[PDB]
Design a protein around this ligand. Structure first.
Ligand SMILES: O=C(O)CCCC[C@@H]1SC[C@@H]2NC(=O)N[C@@H]21
Ligand SMILES: O=C(O)CCCC[C@@H]1SC[C@@H]2NC(=O)N[C@@H]21
Ligand SMILES: O=C(O)CCCC[C@@H]1SC[C@@H]2NC(=O)N[C@@H]21
Ligand SMILES: O=C(O)CCCC[C@@H]1SC[C@@H]2NC(=O)N[C@@H]21
Lengths: 121, 120, 123, 121
């Protein structure tokens, strides 16, 4: 396995855990995501994700979408995978979380922003 | 159904997006022709992948575009709204990640913005 | 007055209004923000802002902070003032709204992001 | 001095330093920001900031603007000051950096987003 293939198990600074499947020839992948935190944390369940990474660069950019199975929200993550001289991989990401609102007039309220660093589990 | 993302959309910048069939889990692929880029002479049609909620009449959704002509990747997240006349609008916010050479330069690498899409 | 001096009265695309006073020699200004929207819209009242713009540029960047007087939140706006050939000014802004949470462990949830375009009030 | 008065000297995770002066009755303050990073770090100079914090809350929110004195850019920071059981203060912030572009048609490219945590010097 080449470094910065997203395939494998990762966690982040909030305690969330992500598993990513095989990455195909075009950089596409699926996975699962167990968030440590939510608007309603009692409701949390494992949720699916789908994304794409670049493959030429040793330190590729990537993004993915998480369809939360327990709420009407969706999150997206985008970032770059870095490798240090010891071979330690870190995903540096920023994210947007979209809430569902019932009226288009309330759109302004509905997007949160943040960051997460992921390392191999 | 209204707010099935399948079809052709454009946005306020002139970009054009086509989305394929949405499967039972809300997954879809598509293509994106951006009207703008860091190097607009290099723009080519690029692939996207994402997921929408299915039940809601006004579902949230997300997708990733893998730009085929740069090292960058963008993600879009938003909600599809339908007014009482039947008109659909995708209200989105996006992040664009640029590639940097070293982890110490990570702070510089993420742009944020917005786009509204309507059917082409 | 110069185009893109922030001094004056501005509308945005959510129906909000702000009025900004004189911009000093360092680009600093104060004003009052009247939001059309909020987490608790029945509590809305006018709220103070404070910011800085670049002064020399024909199309300057700027930023400001709004201290909401009716909640524990603070918002910041950053953007650029553009002037078209007819003299029409547009403030293209992006914003972050910070909500107050009680525990550092909930920090991840606390920052909303969005955009606003402002134009000068007519007359 | 009460905890989470912003007056004083702070640094962040990138190594940037800021010094904030007296906070007035309305929560207003000024100061100097010394960024550790820039598009061109050989051009970095001391730059002014101006902001407002809430005063009554034990863990107040606040924001400030930095007018960079060595580029046409402006940055804004927004966050909350937290105090732990031992009295240690942390400012958890997110920021936007606006770059100057030539025309309104280029506006889409002009805004970076990020995060910083500050602690007292
Ligand atoms: O709250 C919800 O309804 C869905 C879960 C949202 C979890 C968010 S996604 C961004 C941040 N990073 C995480 O690992 N969890 C939160
Ligand atoms: O510049 C690049 O290298 C890739 C193209 C990025 C285009 C961005 S994605 C966000 C914004 N919305 C658009 O339709 N195009 C731009
Ligand atoms: O909800 C609150 O407690 C305070 C008001 C927040 C209003 C926000 S700031 C960003 C957006 N633009 C506006 O003109 N109003 C909203
Ligand atoms: O590059 C420039 O033209 C001005 C300096 C920008 C520095 C940014 S502001 C956000 C981030 N946090 C910092 O402490 N510095 C960078």
């Amino acid at each position: 396995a080449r470094k910065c293939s997203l395939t494998g198990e990762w966690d982040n600074d909030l305690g969330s855990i992500m598993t990513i499947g095989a990455v195909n020839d075009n950089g596409e992948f699926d996975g699962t995501y167990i968030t440590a935190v939510a608007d309603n944390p009692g409701n949390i369940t494992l949720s699916p994700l789908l994304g794409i990474q670049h493959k030429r660069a040793s330190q590729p950019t990537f993004g993915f979408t998480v369809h939360w199975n327990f709420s009407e929200s969706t999150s997206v993550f985008v970032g770059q995978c870095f490798v240090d001289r010891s071979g330690k991989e870190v995903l540096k990401t920023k994210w947007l979380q979209r809430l569902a609102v019932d009226d288009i007039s309330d759109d302004w309220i509905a997007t949160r922003v943040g960051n997460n660093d992921f390392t191999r589990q």
